[PDB]
Amino acid sequence: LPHFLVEPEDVYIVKNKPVLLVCKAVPATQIFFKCNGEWVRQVDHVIERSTDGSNGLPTMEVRINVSRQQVEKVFGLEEYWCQCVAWSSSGTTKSQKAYIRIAYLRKNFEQEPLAKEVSLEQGIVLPCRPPEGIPPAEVEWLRNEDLVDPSLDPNVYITREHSLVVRQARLADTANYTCVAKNIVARRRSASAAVIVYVDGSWSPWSKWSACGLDCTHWRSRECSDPAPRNGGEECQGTDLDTRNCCV
Ligand SMILES: *[C@@H]1O[C@H](CO)[C@@H](O)[C@H](O)[C@H]1NC(C)=O
């Protein structure tokens, strides 16, 4: 019985360029391809006959070119497939069904990231669902122009559901985040989502009481710097100076 060395793999049509399906078996006397329940012509087959290194048995290597027009013309229930069959003195053998699909990628995203307002300690999740296409598109994130790398920082990482997760604000500051769907046919960039990191201003501890001056009054100082109000963040609610009656 013949044993396959090289089996036909699942190939995709990029643009309109032909695909090659390599098939090799040992021992082989005759080798033919069967596409969608129909045999391929002998002239279309590119045969390669050679003697095996391990034992004195004939080895055959065959390759067929399948164009874009050949795939799209076949209309039915199941997808375009090509199975390689090998012959010998003992019997026949069947290889794995290699599925040939026309590669594509849509323009409209299923889900795009939106603008979010977050504080210094709180964490945010930026969701993204890439457009439909065969094979599925890989997801890459951009912080403004620069590519987001999850290996550089543990606080910034991309989940299995393509969403970007950030747990802090100083480790990932203010930036327009855009989701990029990457496929062999086309690269699709989503709309930029403005992520703003605000610092809510809270008062600093009270200073020491000043000496009792004239008109029986003494003041105390206060500052809005623990933490200081940055970006959109709200200012400190209260007074900068506190007056109290204390003398002669
Ligand atoms: C996003 O870019 C716009 C200009 O196109 C800018 O005005 C805005 O502040 C940016 N947002 C962030 C978070 O950088």
**Residue 85 burial by CB count (10 A; 0-12/13-18/19+): exposed, middle or buried?**
middle
Domain residue extents for the chain: 1-103, 104-201
Distance CA 167, CA 6 (A): 48
Quote the tokens at residue 241.
């100076």
**101-102 and 12-13: which strand pairing?**
parallel
Q: Is 195 in the pocket of ligand 1 (CB under 6 A)?
A: yes
Pocket test for ligand 1, best of 176, 198, 231 (most atoms within 8 A of CB): 176
Question: Three-state SS for 189?
Answer: strand
Quote the tokens at residue 12.
């995709």
**Residue keyed to tokens 């979010």:** 116
Judge contact between 91 and 73, C-beta under 8 A: no
What type of residue is 164?
A: L
Question: Three-state SS for 172?
Answer: coil
**Residue 160 burial by CB count (10 A; 0-12/13-18/19+): exposed, middle or buried?**
exposed
**What 3 state SS string does 129-168 have?**
ECCCCCCCCEEEEEECCEECCCCCCCCEEECCCCCEEECC
Quote the tokens at residue 185.
């046919």
Judge contact between 24 and 2, C-beta under 8 A: no
Q: Residue 3 is inside which H or E element, if any?
A: strand 3-6
**Residue keyed to tokens 């709309």:** 191
Distance CA 108, CA 105 (A): 9
**Residue 31 burial by CB count (10 A; 0-12/13-18/19+): exposed, middle or buried?**
buried
Judge contact between 98 and 21, C-beta under 8 A: yes
Judge contact between 100 and 19, C-beta under 8 A: yes
**Residue keyed to tokens 């046919």:** 185
Distance CA 45, CA 152 (A): 50
Quote the tokens at residue 187.
């690269």
Q: Residue 69 is inside which H or E element, if any?
A: helix 68-73
DSSP 44: T
The angle at the Cα of 113, spanning 110 to 115, to the nearest 5 degrees, equals 145
Distance CA 76, CA 87 (A): 30
- Could you identify the atom of ligand 1 that is nearest to the CA of residue 144? 14
Q: Is 35 in the pocket of ligand 1 (CB under 6 A)?
A: no
**Residues pairing with 83 in the sheet:** 34
Phi, psi of 70 (to 5 degrees): -70, -35
Q: Which of 5, 47, 4, 27 is closest to 90 using CA atoms?
A: 27
Judge contact between 179 and 109, C-beta under 8 A: yes
What's the alpha-carbon Rg for the chain, to the nearest Å? 34
Judge contact between 96 and 82, C-beta under 8 A: no
Phi-psi region of 42 (alpha: psi -120 to 50; beta: other; left: phi over 0): alpha
CB atoms within 10 A of CB 105: 20
Judge contact between 148 and 164, C-beta under 8 A: yes
Question: Three-state SS for 124?
Answer: strand
Q: How far is CA 188 from CA 15, 34, 97, 141, in A?
A: 16, 36, 31, 12
Distance CA 139, CA 128 (A): 8
Q: How far is the CA of 209 from the centre of ligand 1 (A)?
A: 45
Q: Is 115 in the pocket of ligand 1 (CB under 6 A)?
A: no
Q: How far is the CA of 195 from the centre of ligand 1 (A)?
A: 9
Judge contact between 28 and 60, C-beta under 8 A: yes
- Could you identify the atom of ligand 1 that is nearest to the CA of residue 174? 13
Enter the resolution in angstroms: 2.4
